Amino acid sequence: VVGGLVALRGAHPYIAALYWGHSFCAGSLIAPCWVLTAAHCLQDRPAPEDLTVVLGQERRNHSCEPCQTLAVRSYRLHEAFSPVSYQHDLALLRLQEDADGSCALLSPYVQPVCLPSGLCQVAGWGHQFEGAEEYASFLQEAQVPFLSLERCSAPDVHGSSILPGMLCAGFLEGGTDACQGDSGGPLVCELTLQGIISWGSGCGDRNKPGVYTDVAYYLAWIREHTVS
C-alpha cells in the first residue's frame, strides 16, 4: 500500500499470506477453515498441495511466535471470473485441518473478519509506491474512502472498465492505495470485509482510485460455497 503507515501487530488478525512456488498473494480469514482471496491469484491453477497459508504474520515471509502455518486442501475460483475484464475476481481457499479437526486456532492474533452485513482501512505487504523494488516488510495499512460506482465509472476516472461486482476506494486527488503485491488483500470498513484488492492503474495516481472485488455483491456465492 501507498501513503500509509506501519500497522499495529494485532490490527489485522484476519489477514492471511499465501505462498507457492515463486508466487505470493494475500487474503482474509472469513471462517476458521476458509480464506477469501482474489481469483486472479490462482488463475494459473497451482496444485493445492503446493500452497502454504500463514496466519498471524506481521513481517512478510517472517516466522513468528503467533504465526500459524497451514496447508491448503482445496480452492474454488468463481465460475464467472474473466482474466480479461477481471470481473468476478474472487476465490475461496479451504484450509487443511489437523488431527483434532481444527484449522486456524483462534487467538488475539488469528481471527476471522466479518462478512458485510449489507471510512475504510486497506492493508498489505506490497509496494509502498509504484515501481518499488521490494515488498514492505512490516504490514502497512492506510485509510481510504469508499467511492460511489457512478463516480468511479466516470470517463475521467475508470470508465467502461467498472463492471458489476467491482467497487472502488481512494482519494480522487490521489495518494493512498494498494499496489502490486497487495492482491487478495482486505478492504475493511464499518469492522467488516467489504472489498478484495484486485487491480487499478498505477498506485494512488490522481483520479485513479483502486478497484476491488465487492464482497457484499457475492454474499450468496460465498455462503453457498462456504458450507463445509
Binding site: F24, Y135, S161, Q180, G181, G200, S201
Partner: peptide, 18 residues
C-alpha cells in the same frame, strides 16, 4: 491509462486505456 493487477507476477487488466 494502463491498468495492472496488484500482484508482484502482474498482468495487464486488457481493454483499459486502449
Amino acid at each position: 491509462x494502463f491498468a495492472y493487477d496488484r500482484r508482484x507476477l502482474s498482468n495487464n487488466x486488457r481493454n483499459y486505456x486502449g
